[PDB]
Design a protein around this motif. Structure first.
Motif, PDB file in Angstrom:
ATOM      1  N   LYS A  17      -7.076 -13.069 -49.300  1.00 31.15           N
ATOM      2  CA  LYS A  17      -6.840 -14.382 -48.888  1.00 31.15           C
ATOM      3  C   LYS A  17      -7.857 -15.215 -49.303  1.00 31.15           C
ATOM      4  O   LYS A  17      -7.789 -16.336 -50.002  1.00 31.15           O
ATOM      5  N   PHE A  18      -9.076 -14.916 -49.124  1.00 30.13           N
ATOM      6  CA  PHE A  18     -10.116 -15.731 -49.208  1.00 30.13           C
ATOM      7  C   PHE A  18     -11.549 -14.954 -49.254  1.00 30.13           C
ATOM      8  O   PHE A  18     -12.132 -14.192 -48.549  1.00 30.13           O
ATOM      9  N   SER A  19     -11.922 -14.676 -50.635  1.00 29.08           N
ATOM     10  CA  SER A  19     -13.145 -13.637 -50.679  1.00 29.08           C
ATOM     11  C   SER A  19     -14.542 -14.376 -51.002  1.00 29.08           C
ATOM     12  O   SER A  19     -14.643 -15.779 -51.265  1.00 29.08           O
ATOM     13  N   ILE A  20     -15.582 -13.934 -51.032  1.00 30.49           N
ATOM     14  CA  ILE A  20     -16.868 -14.307 -51.539  1.00 30.49           C
ATOM     15  C   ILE A  20     -16.900 -14.914 -52.819  1.00 30.49           C
ATOM     16  O   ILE A  20     -17.420 -15.790 -53.157  1.00 30.49           O
ATOM     17  N   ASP A  21     -15.930 -14.374 -53.822  1.00 30.17           N
ATOM     18  CA  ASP A  21     -15.773 -14.955 -55.087  1.00 30.17           C
ATOM     19  C   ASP A  21     -15.060 -16.298 -55.239  1.00 30.17           C
ATOM     20  O   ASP A  21     -15.205 -16.905 -55.951  1.00 30.17           O
ATOM     21  N   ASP A  22     -14.134 -16.432 -54.093  1.00 30.88           N
ATOM     22  CA  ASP A  22     -13.464 -17.712 -54.157  1.00 30.88           C
ATOM     23  C   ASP A  22     -14.293 -18.821 -53.569  1.00 30.88           C
ATOM     24  O   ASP A  22     -14.246 -19.898 -53.868  1.00 30.88           O
ATOM     25  N   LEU A  23     -15.332 -18.204 -52.591  1.00 32.17           N
ATOM     26  CA  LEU A  23     -16.251 -19.331 -52.360  1.00 32.17           C
ATOM     27  C   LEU A  23     -17.149 -19.887 -53.349  1.00 32.17           C
ATOM     28  O   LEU A  23     -17.598 -20.930 -53.634  1.00 32.17           O
ATOM     29  N   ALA A  24     -17.559 -18.499 -54.143  1.00 32.45           N
ATOM     30  CA  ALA A  24     -18.512 -18.832 -55.319  1.00 32.45           C
ATOM     31  C   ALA A  24     -17.728 -19.688 -56.134  1.00 32.45           C
ATOM     32  O   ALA A  24     -18.472 -20.787 -56.944  1.00 32.45           O
ATOM     33  N   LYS A  25     -16.615 -19.640 -56.568  1.00 29.98           N
ATOM     34  CA  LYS A  25     -15.847 -20.708 -57.298  1.00 29.98           C
ATOM     35  C   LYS A  25     -15.764 -21.649 -56.931  1.00 29.98           C
ATOM     36  O   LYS A  25     -16.101 -22.913 -57.784  1.00 29.98           O
ATOM     37  N   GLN A  26     -15.442 -21.914 -55.504  1.00 32.23           N
ATOM     38  CA  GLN A  26     -15.369 -23.285 -55.002  1.00 32.23           C
ATOM     39  C   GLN A  26     -16.582 -23.970 -54.658  1.00 32.23           C
ATOM     40  O   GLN A  26     -16.761 -25.323 -54.772  1.00 32.23           O
ATOM     41  N   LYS A  27     -17.797 -23.347 -54.649  1.00 30.94           N
ATOM     42  CA  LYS A  27     -19.196 -23.805 -54.414  1.00 30.94           C
ATOM     43  C   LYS A  27     -19.301 -24.113 -53.121  1.00 30.94           C
ATOM     44  O   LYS A  27     -20.399 -23.627 -52.233  1.00 30.94           O
ATOM     45  N   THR A  28     -18.314 -25.094 -52.414  1.00 32.96           N
ATOM     46  CA  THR A  28     -18.374 -25.228 -51.155  1.00 32.96           C
ATOM     47  C   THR A  28     -16.834 -24.996 -50.594  1.00 32.96           C
ATOM     48  O   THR A  28     -15.937 -25.428 -51.362  1.00 32.96           O
ATOM     49  N   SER A  29     -16.567 -25.008 -49.418  1.00 33.93           N
ATOM     50  CA  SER A  29     -15.315 -24.871 -48.580  1.00 33.93           C
ATOM     51  C   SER A  29     -15.365 -25.088 -47.139  1.00 33.93           C
ATOM     52  O   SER A  29     -16.147 -24.686 -46.534  1.00 33.93           O
ATOM     53  N   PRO A  30     -14.347 -25.702 -46.920  1.00 36.65           N
ATOM     54  CA  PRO A  30     -14.128 -25.744 -45.003  1.00 36.65           C
ATOM     55  C   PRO A  30     -13.823 -24.373 -44.692  1.00 36.65           C
ATOM     56  O   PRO A  30     -13.245 -23.798 -45.586  1.00 36.65           O
ATOM     57  N   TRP A  31     -14.543 -23.998 -43.520  1.00 32.19           N
ATOM     58  CA  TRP A  31     -13.853 -22.795 -42.960  1.00 32.19           C
ATOM     59  C   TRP A  31     -12.729 -22.877 -42.289  1.00 32.19           C
ATOM     60  O   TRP A  31     -12.719 -22.931 -41.077  1.00 32.19           O
ATOM     61  N   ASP A  32     -11.446 -22.904 -42.813  1.00 38.43           N
ATOM     62  CA  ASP A  32     -10.214 -23.209 -42.062  1.00 38.43           C
ATOM     63  C   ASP A  32      -9.799 -21.948 -41.686  1.00 38.43           C
ATOM     64  O   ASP A  32      -9.980 -20.927 -42.017  1.00 38.43           O
ATOM     65  N   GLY A  33      -8.788 -22.264 -40.672  1.00 35.65           N
ATOM     66  CA  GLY A  33      -7.848 -21.243 -40.176  1.00 35.65           C
ATOM     67  C   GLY A  33      -8.173 -20.440 -38.947  1.00 35.65           C
ATOM     68  O   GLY A  33      -7.588 -19.228 -38.987  1.00 35.65           O
ATOM     69  N   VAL A  34      -9.430 -20.651 -38.586  1.00 34.92           N
ATOM     70  CA  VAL A  34      -9.911 -19.899 -37.307  1.00 34.92           C
ATOM     71  C   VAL A  34      -8.939 -20.368 -36.156  1.00 34.92           C
ATOM     72  O   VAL A  34      -9.006 -21.461 -35.806  1.00 34.92           O
ATOM     73  N   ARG A  35      -8.457 -19.372 -35.445  1.00 34.49           N
ATOM     74  CA  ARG A  35      -7.581 -19.614 -34.425  1.00 34.49           C
ATOM     75  C   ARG A  35      -7.871 -18.750 -32.959  1.00 34.49           C
ATOM     76  O   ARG A  35      -6.971 -18.527 -32.344  1.00 34.49           O
ATOM     77  N   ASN A  36      -9.219 -18.479 -33.156  1.00 34.97           N
ATOM     78  CA  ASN A  36      -9.753 -17.954 -31.907  1.00 34.97           C
ATOM     79  C   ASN A  36     -10.603 -18.795 -31.119  1.00 34.97           C
ATOM     80  O   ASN A  36     -11.412 -19.348 -31.700  1.00 34.97           O
ATOM     81  N   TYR A  37     -10.343 -19.215 -29.928  1.00 33.99           N
ATOM     82  CA  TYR A  37     -11.235 -20.280 -29.139  1.00 33.99           C
ATOM     83  C   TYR A  37     -12.549 -19.989 -29.314  1.00 33.99           C
ATOM     84  O   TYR A  37     -13.625 -20.918 -29.270  1.00 33.99           O
ATOM     85  N   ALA A  38     -12.902 -18.721 -28.969  1.00 35.31           N
ATOM     86  CA  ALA A  38     -14.542 -18.308 -28.703  1.00 35.31           C
ATOM     87  C   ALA A  38     -15.130 -18.643 -30.486  1.00 35.31           C
ATOM     88  O   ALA A  38     -16.168 -19.215 -30.372  1.00 35.31           O
ATOM     89  N   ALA A  39     -14.387 -18.049 -31.217  1.00 40.77           N
ATOM     90  CA  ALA A  39     -14.763 -18.317 -32.705  1.00 40.77           C
ATOM     91  C   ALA A  39     -14.795 -19.840 -33.001  1.00 40.77           C
ATOM     92  O   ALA A  39     -15.774 -20.415 -33.690  1.00 40.77           O
ATOM     93  N   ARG A  40     -13.958 -20.566 -32.502  1.00 40.00           N
ATOM     94  CA  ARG A  40     -14.074 -22.137 -32.887  1.00 40.00           C
ATOM     95  C   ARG A  40     -15.239 -22.618 -32.138  1.00 40.00           C
ATOM     96  O   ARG A  40     -15.700 -23.502 -32.546  1.00 40.00           O
ATOM     97  N   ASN A  41     -15.574 -22.086 -30.843  1.00 41.34           N
ATOM     98  CA  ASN A  41     -16.824 -22.739 -30.004  1.00 41.34           C
ATOM     99  C   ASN A  41     -18.014 -22.384 -30.837  1.00 41.34           C
ATOM    100  O   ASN A  41     -19.025 -23.120 -30.839  1.00 41.34           O
ATOM    101  N   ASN A  42     -18.020 -21.036 -31.264  1.00 41.34           N
ATOM    102  CA  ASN A  42     -19.262 -20.514 -32.232  1.00 41.34           C
ATOM    103  C   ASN A  42     -19.385 -21.751 -33.400  1.00 41.34           C
ATOM    104  O   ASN A  42     -20.582 -22.113 -33.587  1.00 41.34           O
ATOM    105  N   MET A  43     -18.132 -22.109 -34.062  1.00 41.12           N
ATOM    106  CA  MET A  43     -18.476 -23.142 -35.076  1.00 41.12           C
ATOM    107  C   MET A  43     -18.949 -24.434 -34.744  1.00 41.12           C
ATOM    108  O   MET A  43     -19.523 -25.177 -35.453  1.00 41.12           O
ATOM    109  N   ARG A  44     -18.450 -24.769 -33.492  1.00 42.77           N
ATOM    110  CA  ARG A  44     -19.114 -25.920 -32.999  1.00 42.77           C
ATOM    111  C   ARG A  44     -20.573 -25.975 -32.749  1.00 42.77           C
ATOM    112  O   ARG A  44     -21.091 -26.897 -32.487  1.00 42.77           O
ATOM    113  N   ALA A  45     -21.029 -24.693 -32.205  1.00 42.44           N
ATOM    114  CA  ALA A  45     -22.256 -24.344 -32.297  1.00 42.44           C
ATOM    115  C   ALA A  45     -23.252 -24.136 -33.439  1.00 42.44           C
ATOM    116  O   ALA A  45     -24.474 -24.075 -33.562  1.00 42.44           O
ATOM    117  N   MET A  46     -22.602 -24.231 -34.714  1.00 42.47           N
ATOM    118  CA  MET A  46     -23.346 -23.969 -35.930  1.00 42.47           C
ATOM    119  C   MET A  46     -24.042 -25.514 -36.350  1.00 42.47           C
ATOM    120  O   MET A  46     -23.527 -26.401 -35.948  1.00 42.47           O
TER     121      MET A  46
END
Length: 157
Positions: free
Chosen positions: A16-45
């Motif tokens: 779906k999305f590999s390290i080479d996709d990020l490399a190609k895009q240079k930056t990317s939003p981190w979309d598609g996280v649908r676990n609330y604990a993980a979501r909260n970890n992103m709010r803490a970044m």
């Protein structure tokens, strides 16, 4: 807190999305996280936080490279995309529970640092990676981060 650089692991399925996709895009939003604990970890970044790019649900799971947080958490608009796998039928323009950071590519490692090796180091025994399976965005300790980067160097020699 935000005055100090913190460390995380982000899981992505590479077909779906590999390290080479990020490399190609240079930056990317981190979309598609649908676990609330993980979501909260992103709010803490915070901006500048370091990220282990981890390939999950694949033949060679493990750490594939490195990224860096470049924007703080904002609404994950894929929740409103009816064509997306990450569509959430109950999210609104005004009430979207899903949030995401932007990350930047930092490094693409020559070969993945496998999960088997990660589980074979005393220094890594307490990683969340091993405890918490649905947690797609995880805190990493400073020593855990350090040890993993050391392992990549050993492997590259």
């Amino acid at each position: 807190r935000a005055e100090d650089i913190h460390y995380w692991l982000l899981k992505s399925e590479p077909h779906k999305f590999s390290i080479d996709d990020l490399a190609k895009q240079k930056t990317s939003p981190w979309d598609g996280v649908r676990n609330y604990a993980a979501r909260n970890n992103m709010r803490a970044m915070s901006v500048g936080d370091k990220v282990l790019f981890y390939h999950s649900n694949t033949k060679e799971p493990g750490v594939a490279g490195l990224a860096e947080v470049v924007r703080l958490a904002y609404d994950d608009f894929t929740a409103l995309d009816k064509t997306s796998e990450y569509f959430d039928p109950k999210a609104t323009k005004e009430k979207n529970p899903w949030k995401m950071v932007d990350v930047k590519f930092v490094a693409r490692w020559d070969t993945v640092l496998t999960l088997h090796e990660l589980k074979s180091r005393r220094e890594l025994q307490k990683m969340a990676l091993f405890t918490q399976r649905r947690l797609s965005v995880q805190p990493v300790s400073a020593s855990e981060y350090a040890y993993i980067l050391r392992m990549n160097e050993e492997q590259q020699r």
